[PDB]
Amino acid sequence: EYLLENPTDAKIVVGKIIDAARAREAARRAREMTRRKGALDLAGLPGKLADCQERDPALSELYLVEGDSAGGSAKQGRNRKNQAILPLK
C-alpha cells in the first residue's frame, strides 16, 4: 500500500536496488548461456534430471539428492526458475 501511495520514493528505492543488483552482477565471472532440459527439447540429458528454466549459469542451482523418493519430495517444493534436481541412487 505504501509503495502504491508513494511513487517517487518507490522509484528512488527501486533505483537503489537496481544499482546494487548491477554491482552484484558486474563482479561475476564471465560465462555463456547453456541449453536446459525442456518439453520440446531434452538436449541429451538424463531422464532423472528435473532441470530449470533459467538458461544462464550463475543464476541456477543443482541439488544432488540421495534417491528417487527424496527427489520427488524436493521436486514438488522448489523454484522451477533456478533450482534443478538430479536424484542419485
Add this chain to the structure above:
DNA sequence: TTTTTTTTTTTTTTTTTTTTTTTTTTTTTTTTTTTTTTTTTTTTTTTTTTTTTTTTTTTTTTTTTTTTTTTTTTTTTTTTTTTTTTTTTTTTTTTTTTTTTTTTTTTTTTTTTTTTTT
C-alpha cells in the same frame, strides 16, 4: 509527426557427425564312428610224468689274424659370451561374508480413447 539505425529468430537447407541396422571369420556344440572292458563255452590249447636215441662239450694239439704296439695330426671337446625359454616373487584385480544406502520390472481383469492398416 514522420522518418532512420540496429538487433535477433526465423524462411531455414546443406555439411559434419553420430546412431542404428547389418552379415565373414574362429570358437562351440551334437552326431556318428571307432577304441576299451566283462561274461559263456568251446574246441582247443597247454601243464606235467615216463622212455628214448641223439649231437654238442670237453681229454689233447695246431696256427694266424685279430691283439699287441708308437706316434702324427687331426677335431671333437671345452671355454666364454650372448640369446631364448622356463619358472617363480610380486603386484593387481575380483569375489564372498553381514548390516546399511538406493532403486527397477512382467502379467490379469474392463472400458474408453488414440493410432495404424484395409
